[PDB]
Paper text:
The [name] (M pro) of coronaviruses plays a key role in viral replication, thus serving as a hot target for drug design. M pro is able to process polyproteins to produce several nonstructural proteins (NSPs) necessary for viral replication. The recognition site of coronaviral M pro depends on Gln at the P1 position, and no proteases in humans share a similar cleavage site. PF-00835231 is an inhibitor designed for the [name] of [name]-CoV that emerged in 2003, but its clinical trials were suspended due to the rapid disappearance of the [name] outbreak.
We then used the co-crystallization method to determine the crystal structures of several M pro mutants of [name]-CoV-2 in complex with PF-00835231. The resolutions for these structures are 1.79 Å (M pro G15S with PF-00835231)A, 1.68 Å (M pro K90R with PF-00835231), 1.65 Å (M pro M49I with PF-00835231), 1.72 Å (M pro P132H with PF-00835231), 1.64 Å (M pro S46F with PF-00835231), 1.66 Å (M pro [name] with PF-00835231) and 1.91 Å (M pro Y54C with PF-00835231), respectively. In each of these seven complex structures, each [name]-CoV-2 M pro mutant molecule appears as a dimer form, which is also the form with enzymatic activity. The details of the interaction between M pro [name] and PF-00835231 show that PF-00835231 interacts with several residues, including His41, Phe140, Cys145, His163, His164, Glu166, and Gln189. The results clearly showed that the ligand binding patterns are not disrupted by these mutations. The IC 50 value of PF-00835231 against [name]-CoV-2 M pro was 0.0086 μM, while the IC 50 value of PF-00835231 against [name]-CoV-2 M pro mutants, including K90R, M49I, G15S, [name], P132H and Y54C, ranged from 1.2 to 3.7 μM.
Author numbering:
A (entry chain B): 2 to 300
B (entry chain A): 3 to 300
Write the structure that this text describes.
């Protein structure tokens, strides 16, 4: 079996709180004695239309912020702003703070999302940072401040804080230093994303996952050069495949005994011939949201 | 719409490892009892055709190694209930959530927390197929991993993992140790019955499409439940039960499309095909989203 698998979310759930300023409420992330949340919590609905954030934040006091961890109210004893993230200092340390790091992920990398509402975790699922710096998430009203993360030997690497749903239904957010992924900004305005492309290295990793799980129907006897593959890939709005990608796919090629460029010839055939109503690992579409690491970790 | 698992933290705090001899798997620690698959008592040779009652005779409390991480929990009693072992331990788990044990029906979904050596590794949604298998993702050492739903902070445990079939799907028990489907906990190649499509979930999917403005497939016809069930079975679809009709109630009321009107719409999709059209951006009808899943994502 091969499934989209998220990291266990317990270490993050114990950090989710509710942050309220006036009539505006969203989720916050509580690590040690700091609560991180989207800065537009300070805005009224009219402010979000065209906010001058530094001007609005100087007009706020500590007592303007209501932070709730479960039923407990944590007193704000300080506040600062880092790009699009608000940092609320509280008088209580979160006893459940995990070992953690803040990281900015690269396009094509995956992370688990813990969707939260009113400070309470609701569901967990896997997302990839798209090449156009959106993510195809599942987020409703009140999900802002939900975070994305990876977990490596008990250490949580936070990489995403949720801010926005674009008109097309995809999602946009920041790293935990408050810098958006993509050309987006935190204003109540309709924003279009750049043209998205398909994460080629992930499609290849996923075809390897299919072979590891006993499916080989898409393979062929042909091969290709790296450049000839990249010409066809770009024609189909796939990202270029680099030699670093070829190397990263090494273990999966070694595990299956299928040279990377042999697998590229397979994908090239799938792109030019379609799948003709057949299916790969249950999907009628070429899946690009598993990294080579996601495949290795699960297989 | 996407497969969304429940947050797993309340279950992570219950996972332990259980070793007997050199055989290690996962267990579930609730209050002062640890639940785990009974084949932990088997030697690899014993798994081929085990007599569990005779095997358990030769076992005492002191043969069982229960560890939360590396911390041993002393076993003070043991008993077998169907295919699960219940180990009484001397410590009540302080992380025990409000919980119950439930036996689910085919078509219901649940989250699986995949674990190895008592350590949670990942979480994903599964659906119980009509042939009582799940399309899981399980490696060696995963037995004892559990499936669950969370409703208002109460965790309903429904699945404990035991087996991978030759076809690569998975089989297990409820938390009273009764297998889902015609399977046995022995080292033998077992086949499941032919599977079918989960009709009630396809209907839930069509409701989700209507909710989102995608309703070209709505027809001008209706059907009786009996007539629909007879036609569905000729397309390898599950027949609907009265319980299925009632769990579609909220979606029916929300859209104003009667359940039997949606059945007639599905009946036309089965007999005439989609004619190269899509529903929620897909040529295939999805059968792994329950009416509850649709409500929770919409
Ligand atoms: C937050 O929870 C805000 O606290 C909210 C999350 C989205 C709501 C629906 N789905 C979500 O993921 N985010 C927003 O509401 C943001 C707020 C900004 C950053 C100040 N705004 C949008 O996502 C937004 C605004 C508009 C829009 O206007 C006009 C027009 C079209 C799309 C759109 N998205
Ligand atoms: C547990 O980890 C075991 O404690 C393991 C989990 C599977 C291993 C690979 N993926 C899994 O989900 N379970 C087993 O190995 C069980 C043990 C039984 C219940 C005693 N056995 C099988 O899953 C099994 C045995 C055989 C078989 O024999 C011969 C032939 C074909 C398939 C098969 N599966």
């Amino acid at each position: 079996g091969f499934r989209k698998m998220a990291f266990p979310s317990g270490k993050v759930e114990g950090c989710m709180v509710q942050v309220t300023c006036g009539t505006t409420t969203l989720n916050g992330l509580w690590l040690d004695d700091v609560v991180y949340c989207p800065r537009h919590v300070i805005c009224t609905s009219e402010d979000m239309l065209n906010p001058n954030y530094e001007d609005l934040l100087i007009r706020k006091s500590n007592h303007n912020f209501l932070v709730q961890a479960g039923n407990v109210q944590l007193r704000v004893i300080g506040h600062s702003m880092q790009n699009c993230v608000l940092k609320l200092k509280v008088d209580t340390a979160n006893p459940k703070t995990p070992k953690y790091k803040f990281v900015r992920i690269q396009p094509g990398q995956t992370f688990s999302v813990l969707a939260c509402y009113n400070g309470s975790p609701s569901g967990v699922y896997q997302c990839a940072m798209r090449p156009n710096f959106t993510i195809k998430g599942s987020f409703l009203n009140g999900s802002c401040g939900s975070v994305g993360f990876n977990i490596d030997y008990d250490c949580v690497s936070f990489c995403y804080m949720h801010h926005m749903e674009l008109p097309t239904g995809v999602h946009a957010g920041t790293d935990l230093e408050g810098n958006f992924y993509g050309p987006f900004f935190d204003r109540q305005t309709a924003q279009a994303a750049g043209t998205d492309t398909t994460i080629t290295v992930n499609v290849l990793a996923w075809l390897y996952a299919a072979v590891i799980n006993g499916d080989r129907w898409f393979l062929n006897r042909f091969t290709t050069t790296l450049n000839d593959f990249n010409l066809v890939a770009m024609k189909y709005n796939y990202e270029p495949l680099t030699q670093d990608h070829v190397d990263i796919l090494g273990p999966l090629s070694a595990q299956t005994g299928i040279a990377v460029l042999d697998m590229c010839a397979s994908l090239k055939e799938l792109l030019q011939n379609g799948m003709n109503g057949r299916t790969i690992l249950g999907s009628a579409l070429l899946e690009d949201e598993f990294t080579p690491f996601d495949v290795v970790r699960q297989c």
